[PDB]
Amino acid sequence: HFKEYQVIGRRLPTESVPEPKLFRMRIFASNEVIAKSRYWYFLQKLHKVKKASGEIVSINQINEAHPTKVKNFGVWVRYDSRSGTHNMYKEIRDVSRVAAVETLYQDMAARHRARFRSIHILKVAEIEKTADVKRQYVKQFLTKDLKFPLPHRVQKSTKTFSYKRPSTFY
Amino acid sequence: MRVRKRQSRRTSTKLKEGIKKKASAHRKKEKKMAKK
Amino acid sequence: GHLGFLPRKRAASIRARVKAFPKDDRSKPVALTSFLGYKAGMTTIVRDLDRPGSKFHKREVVEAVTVVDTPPVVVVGVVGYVETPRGLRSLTTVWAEHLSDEVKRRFYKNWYKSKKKAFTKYSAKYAQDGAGIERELARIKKYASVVRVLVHTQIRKTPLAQKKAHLAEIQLNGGSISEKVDW
Amino acid sequence: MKYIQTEQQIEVPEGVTVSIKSRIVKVVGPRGTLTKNLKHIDVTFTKVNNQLIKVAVHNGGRKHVAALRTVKSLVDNMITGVTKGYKYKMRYVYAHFPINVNIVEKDGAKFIEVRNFLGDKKIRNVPVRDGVTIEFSTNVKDEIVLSGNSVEDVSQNAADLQQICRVRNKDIRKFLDGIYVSHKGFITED
Amino acid sequence: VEPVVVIDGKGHLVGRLASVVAKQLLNGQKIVVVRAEELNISGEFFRNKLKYHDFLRKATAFNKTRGPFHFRAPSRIFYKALRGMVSHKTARGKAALERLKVFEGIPPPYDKKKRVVVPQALRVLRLKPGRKYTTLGKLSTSVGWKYEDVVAKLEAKRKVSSAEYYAKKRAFTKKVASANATAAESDVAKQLAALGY
Amino acid sequence: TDSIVKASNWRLVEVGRVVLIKKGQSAGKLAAIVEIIDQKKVLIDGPKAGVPRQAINLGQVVLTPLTFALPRGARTATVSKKWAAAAVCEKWAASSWAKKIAQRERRAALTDFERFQVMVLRKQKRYTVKKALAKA
RNA sequence: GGCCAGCAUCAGUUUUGGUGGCAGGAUAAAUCCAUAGGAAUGUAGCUUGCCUCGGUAAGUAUUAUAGCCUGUG
RNA sequence: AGAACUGGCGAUGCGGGAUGAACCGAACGUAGAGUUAAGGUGCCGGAAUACACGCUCAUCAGACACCACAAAAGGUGUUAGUUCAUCUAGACAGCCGGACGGUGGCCAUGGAAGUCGGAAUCCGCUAAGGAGUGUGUAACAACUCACCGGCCGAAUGAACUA
RNA sequence: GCAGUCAAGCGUUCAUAGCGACAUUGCUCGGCUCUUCCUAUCAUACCGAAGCAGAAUUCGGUAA
RNA sequence: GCUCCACACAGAUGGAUACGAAUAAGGCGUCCUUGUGGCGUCGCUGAACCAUAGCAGGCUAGCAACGGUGCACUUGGCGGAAAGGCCUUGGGUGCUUGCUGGCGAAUUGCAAUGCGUGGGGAUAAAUCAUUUGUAUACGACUUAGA
């Protein structure tokens, strides 16, 4: 389970160059230590720096603004593959950004066999207005007065032997 | 019909370990070929 | 050789038992399906051949035939078999109350030493209005999908110095099991 | 993409009525009755207004939706099978030997004897399905008519009648001889 | 809980069925699967048939009277599925198997007796809708077994007698359920309610 | 001449469908489906029952046959408004299902002496019922 | 005074629950409440089409006799 | 294949990898208790037929392992993508119609009118129609599509990657 | 097989750091006897294509 | 096998509580156009249901109702898949905790669960030996004989 982290760094203040530009980014991780490590990994790719040349100035947990309102998120993803890296845009309906990126990571592993080290989360944005929601499987749930059943339900047994011949009604 | 012979899925220890030697051989080639 | 005729071993008895029977039609009249005798003989026959399409149509053919001696088979019982998921299963056999000296001989290996006390209590079991015999015959007619006839050979009318007749089981291919058990 | 709801519309005319429990379909109407088991298919039927029927697949992949449309087709085929009926007209052609097609009834089987096909002593016996009726076309030479209610009965019998008359170990181009479905249609034309 | 435990091996899944029977034994519980034929597997027919068939192809080369005894009967067909699931060469195994009993169809005194099921091996629950399974009755027949019909016949008749029994039952039940309802609101009654019963 | 096609009637998952949570911190409390997220997850809140507003799996929950009129995306106060106005709590208590849950809970917290009362009362009820039978 | 035990209060190592006090973060984020704007998978209303009597449909209508989102406190 | 340095085995039991010279774990007196490593938790077999999101149906699936060999591909299996395209001036599919005159263009030759073949392969007229996409006749005709246009009303198309 | 002609892409950007599949163009120890098994089948069985008039045949499929 | 004498003695602990079929469907109740019929209701676990209070269950006094149950006699009908059991007709017979009395419990001391032999007799049969030769290395088999 994830957590969003604002992690900043400004390549250690030396002589003749005081107070550098403080490079800020939002990092999804499980804890603070992984977030820090991922941040250094991203910095080495965005420009030519190193872990020893800089310093983590502030690490902060970004709590979700309204964890009760169901949102329509659109996530820009890129990831290393069997071949070269490539962009991807998946649309996710969820309550929070942490939970939406969670469902993405499990889906990316499920459909593309990409682990945690491959995936570069670019930008997670709310899609404010519907009918601008591009993906059809998300637009599937944005219809008026959606009433759908769950036919054929399993009844979870606590014992080995039953005396009914179970009824999978709903 | 006369059901024909089925291939085994038992990998013998000679095969399995020989697979590892052939794999590591492919590595040593790939590291050399990367330099050219 | 032929791998079907294996194991190439000595049989259980001289009287080999019949392995399969002719099917069954449940509208045909009641008639026996197998018979037994005593094979002994071989001889030559000539006959004119009315086999059209042959090289010997309206010609004469000599050929070898065999003479099995077959004295009139005598019925001494009936067996009823239920159809099971395990095959067939004999549930009741019924006998003839008064059987020959030949078959009471078949029930012993040493005939002369015995008191010849074979079916004494079975014949005494009959000794009334029936009551139990008709009960077992109801038992056969009610259940028992196939019905086979217990017979034996007339050994004395054959020149054989054996004196000891053979029991057998012969099914009936006459329909309605009622007509089988009542035959 | 796993559809949430997919539905088709089976249109019921005036003369016919559709009675369905589980997945067994009545089509009771003018010409007769037709029944079809569909418990292999896994759908849900909905009668909206006694004149329109809604088949339904919830949570179905492309394979399950591919089954969803074929139910609509089969139930509709039963409807047009009762209202209009089916009439398959088979014309049989021959070069030299006159093909002799007759209907015989041995043991109540209602067979079709196909005699003298390409000068052949074999007498071809085709079984007639329960619900297909055979008459010969008057005033038109060399024509056999197959008519009934079910599409399967009429069309499979038409297929049987032309697969017994295979031109064996010979030309296709030279030997025209055989029986052929000239016209697939309905009994009542409108 | 009981001395014996009769399972209705219908619409079940040989595997998950056997595996839930297997251990059950080793733990000393007596068990008697029935209606074996009606049992189920998983996968388009042919599939299984092709499977078994290859098994039916393994015989002691030099003397096939010695090698893998290939059993047809749905029972045996499912006793081998439970056997190789229990150290059956040891003593603790033989002793286990010995308290197991597979029956194709339902004979006495099992008939007139309650018969359970095993949810965790129920095809309806386990399997996903619209996915070919392969009954056991078929496979068996199309490979050697030759008593499919009989049982069938002897099974239909075994139900009838069953039905009637029930009918009689539903009735006597109604009668008791109606009398009870009429015993409601009677101090005693009233009270029980407060104590759930 | 009717077209009788019946029926396969389910409990549909919808906005305003009241649910009962099987497992978790809440476990056995009622909540209402406020908004549907996807095929597996819904959004639930039962303020009167005490369950906080949360995204839950439909594996964690079981649908109950009751419904009411709730507008989609309703905050806690709106849920409590329509909850009380429709009186779904009393409609829950009226059902056989709530009576069965309360039945098991009543039998659980029974004292041994109270269990002995059940022993005696069932003996008395047995007597009068057996007299009620063997008459018809 | 020998063999085996039970309980209690103890001490060492450990396993497994119940419950209280705090402290940290956006001094949690939320919810809830008060206020200001918006669009909707558009709400009551209003207009209109053609019919099984009033249902639906195609516009308006910023919530009015549902609600929602965003912003500030 | 040659050096260097490094572990392991060798003088080393034990847990695991079903099995075992070099593979994973592992500070061997005799015992008791607790906790773990590697490996595991359907049953054999001690331990969850756990939970959660997905993907796969295999005519002998797969459980396998620097993802190494047959390995570049084929497939109207299925799920995700990317890049270009069309689309309520009406997308794809579907039938209904037009699909033209110079012109039977020149050589060819018995007969070749777009469609046996040899070379350009042009003009006009339109909404659009190629010196013609295949079937066809000896030669024509006739049909077909590519190109439009008429009802039909929302998505669809191509090339790649996983 | 060698050399060239194309040439999906990849080359650290990328066709002018280079590799490059199918095609294509250049001339040129042996043997006697038995048992069992495999199919990569010569015949027997059934099919598909073939100027297959018939007969005969050629190639191909299932098949031990 | 019958009789005569002599002796010997792999894990029960309230009840395995019986429709069948379907699962994208069913069960039950009711009603009618008697049907793949209308209407109501049920599941979402057997967490059930039936049995269950007495010196390990004694002895007695009753009250209420024609019930429940045990035991053995008994009228049949039913059950062949391993039927070996299932219902039913009745008479007797104890007991009943349906409700209320009447007595006994100690000292157990504060836990240690509390159906074969070895000989007789009587009568069925088998083997050996004999004979057989449809059998045969020897066994075995087929025969024959108070």
Mutate to test the interface with E, among F105, F115, F118 (most CBs of E within 10 A): F118
Looking at the structure, give the CATH architecture of the domain made up of residues E1-147: Alpha-Beta Complex (3.90)
- 3-state secondary structure at position F93: helix
CA distance A95 to A67: 6
Token pair 């129920």 in the structure block, residue:
E122
D58 at A interface, C-beta within 8 A: yes
- Classified by CATH at the fold level, domain D86-190 comes out as Outer Surface Protein A; domain 3 (3.90.930)
Decide if A154 is inside a domain: no
Which CATH number belongs to the domain containing residue F24 in this structure? 2.30.30.30
Contacts E151 to C, Cβ<8 Å: 85
CA dist list (Å): F47 to A45, F57, F84? 49, 19, 10
Strands annotated E in chain A: 3-9, 23-29, 56-61, 71-79, 86-94, 119-126, 148-149
CA angle E125/E126/E130 to nearest 5° reads 85
Residues of E in contact with D42 (CB under 8 A): 129-130
Positions 61-120 in F, CB within 7 angstroms of strand H: none
CB pairs under 8 A between B and E: 5
Give E45-96 as a 3 state SS string. CCHHHHHHHHHCCCCCCCCCCCCCCCCCCHHHHHHHHHHCCCCCCCHHHHHH
Q: Is the CB of B15 under 7 A from strand I?
A: no
| CB atoms near residue A159 (< 10 Å) | 11
| Nucleic strand J near CB of residue F95 (< 7 Å) | yes
User: Are β-strands C43-49 and D112-115 bridged in parallel, bridged antiparallel, or unpaired?
Assistant: unpaired
Residue E190: partners with Cβ closer than 8 Å, 6 or more residues away: none
CA of F95 to C1' of J26 (A): 21
Which residues of E fall below an 8 Å CB-CB distance to F? 175-176, 179-180, 182-183, 186, 188-189, 191-192, 195-197
- DSSP letters for D55-99: EEESSB-HHHHHHHHHHHHHHHHHHHHHHT-EEEEEEEE-SSSPP
**Contacts of residue F118 in chain E, CB cutoff 8 Å?**
192, 195, 197
Residue A166 is assigned to a structural domain of this protein: no
CA-only gyration radius of chain C, Å = 21
Q: Are residues A27 and A49 in the same domain?
A: yes
Comparing alpha-carbon positions, the chain F residue that sits nearest to E172 is: F133
Q: What are the extents of the domains in chain D?
A: 1-85, 86-190
**Dihedral pair phi/psi, residue C45, rounded to 5°:** -125, 140
Domain that holds residue C76: 72-183
Pick the CATH number of E148-197 from 3.40.605.10, 1.20.5.4280, 2.40.128.50, 3.40.50.12280: 1.20.5.4280
To the nearest 5 percent, what fractions of chain D are helix, strand and coil?
A: 20, 35, 45
In this structure, the dihedral spanned by the alpha carbons of residues E90, E96, E97 and E101, taken in order and rounded to 10 degrees, is 170
User: E187 is written with which tokens?
Assistant: 């101090």
Length reported for chain B: 36
* Rounded distance in angstroms from the CA atom of residue D175 to the C1' atom of nucleotide H143: 26
Residue A158 resides in a domain: no
Is there a domain that residue A77 lies in?
yes
Question: What values do phi and psi take at C177, rounded to 5?
Answer: -45, -30
Other residues' Cβ atoms within 10 Å of the Cβ of residue F134: 6
Per-domain residue ranges of chain E: 1-147, 148-197
DSSP state of E120: G
Cα–Cα distance between E175 and E29 in angstroms, integer?
37
Rounded distance between C-alpha atoms, residue F53 and residue F46, angstroms = 7
Q: In degrees rounded to 5, what are phi and psi of residue D128?
A: -105, 125
Query: Min CA distance, F91 vs chain A (Å)?
Result: 19
Peptide-bond breaks in chain D following residues (C–N over 2.5 A): none
Q: What's the CATH number of domain D1-85, 3.40.640.10, 3.40.47.10, 3.40.50.10470, 3.90.930.12? A: 3.90.930.12
Residue C107 near residue C165 (C-beta atoms within 8 A): no
The alpha carbon of residue A157 is apart from the nearest alpha carbon of chain F, in Å, by: 13
Angle at the Cα of D121 from the Cα atoms of D115 and D122, rounded to 5 degrees? 70
Q: Say how far apart CA A170 and CA B22 lie, in whole Å.
A: 57
Name every residue whose Cβ is closer than 8 Å to that of residue A88 and which is 6 or more positions away in sequence.
A76, A77, A78, A79
In single-letter form, the type of residue at position C148 comes to R
Residue C46 and residue C65 in contact, taking contact as beta carbons nearer than 8 Å:
no
Structure tokens at E28: 């000393």
Q: In this structure, what token pair is assigned to residue C72?
A: 């009139």
Q: Are D42 and D64 in contact (CB under 8 A)?
A: yes
Chain pair D-F, CB pairs under 8 angstroms: 32
Experimentally, how was this structure solved? cryo-EM
Cα–Cα distance for residue pair F21/E127, rounded to 1 Å: 25
Taking each helix axis as running N to C, give the angle between helix E74-83 and helix E14-26, from 0 to 180 degrees, rounded to the nearest 10: 60
Strands F41-46 and A119-126: unpaired
* Cα diameter, chain E: 83
Q: How far apart are CA E120 and CA E21, in angstroms?
A: 11
Nearby residues of F101 by Cβ (< 8 Å), 6 or more positions away: F28
- Joined together, the tokens standing for residue C150 give 């217990």
Distance, CA of E114 to CA of E4 (rounded, Å) = 10
**Helix (H, G, I), strand (E, B), or coil: what is residue C135?**
helix
- The separation, in Å, between residue E128 CA and nucleotide I54 C1' comes to 61
Q: Closest Cα of chain D to E147: distance in Å?
A: 27
Nearest to E191 by CA among F112, F121, F113, F132: F121
Q: Which of C22, C10, C32, C26 is nearest to C170 (CA)?
A: C32
Classify the phi-psi angles of C24: left when phi > 0, otherwise alpha if psi is within -120 to 50, otherwise beta: left
The SS3 of residue E158 is helix
Helical H segments across chain D, by residue range: 62-83, 151-163
Which is it for strands C87-95 and D33-37: parallel, antiparallel or unpaired? Answer: unpaired
* Chain D residues with beta carbon closer than 8 angstroms to that of A137: 1-2
Query: How many residues are given for chain A?
Result: 170
Q: Which domain holds residue F59?
A: 12-94
Closest chain C C-alpha to E147 CA, distance in angstroms: 6
- DSSP annotation of C172 reads B
The three-state secondary structure class of D103 is strand
* Distance, CA of C64 to chain centre: 27
CATH code at C159?
3.30.1430.10
Domain containing A124 equals 68-144
Within an 8 Å CB–CB cutoff, is residue A141 touching chain F?
yes
**Is the peptide bond between A67 and the residue preceding it cis, with omega within 30 degrees of 0?**
no
User: Rounded distance, CA C157 to CA D159, Å?
Assistant: 67
3-state helix, strand, coil in chain E (%, to 5): 50, 5, 45
In a domain, A3, yes or no: yes
Contact present, C97 and C108 (Cβ < 8 Å): no
Torsion, Cα of C7, C9, C12, C15 (10° steps)? 100
Quote the CA–CA distance of F7 and D173 in Å, as a whole number.
56
Q: Please name which of F118, F106, F32 lies closest in space to residue F67, comparing C-alpha atoms.
A: F32
Instruction: List all nucleotides in chain I with at least one atom under 7 A from a protein Cβ.
Output: 11, 36, 38-39, 47, 52-55, 63-64
* CATH number, position A133: 3.10.20.10
Q: Do E50 and B3 touch (CB under 8 A)?
A: yes
- Closest residue in chain D to residue E129, using alpha carbons only: D42
DSSP-assigned letters across all residues of F19-64: EEE-SSSS-S-EEEEEEE-SSSEEEEEETTTTEEEEEEETTTEEEE
Does D44 lie at the interface with A, CB-CB under 8 angstroms?
Answer: yes
CA dist E35 and E105 (Å) reads 4
Instruction: Please name the amino acid found at residue F84.
Output: A
Number of domains in chain A: 2
| Distance between the alpha carbon (CA) of E3 and the C1' atom of J110, Å | 38
Say whether the CB atom of D176 is under 7 angstroms from strand I: no
Distance CA D182, CA C136 (A): 68
What distance separates the 2 farthest-apart alpha carbons in chain D? 62
Are A26 and A48 in a shared domain? Answer: yes
**D65: nearest nucleotide, CA–C1' criterion:** J24
CA-closest candidate to residue A123, choices A76, A86, A72: A76
Residues forming beta bridges with residue C171, ordered by sequence position: C148
Distance between CA atoms of D72 and D80, rounded to whole angstroms?
Answer: 12
Report yes or no: D149 and D30 within 8 Å, Cβ to Cβ.
no
Distance of alpha carbon D134 from alpha carbon D128, whole angstroms: 9
> If you measure CA to CA, which chain D residue comes closest to A140?
D4
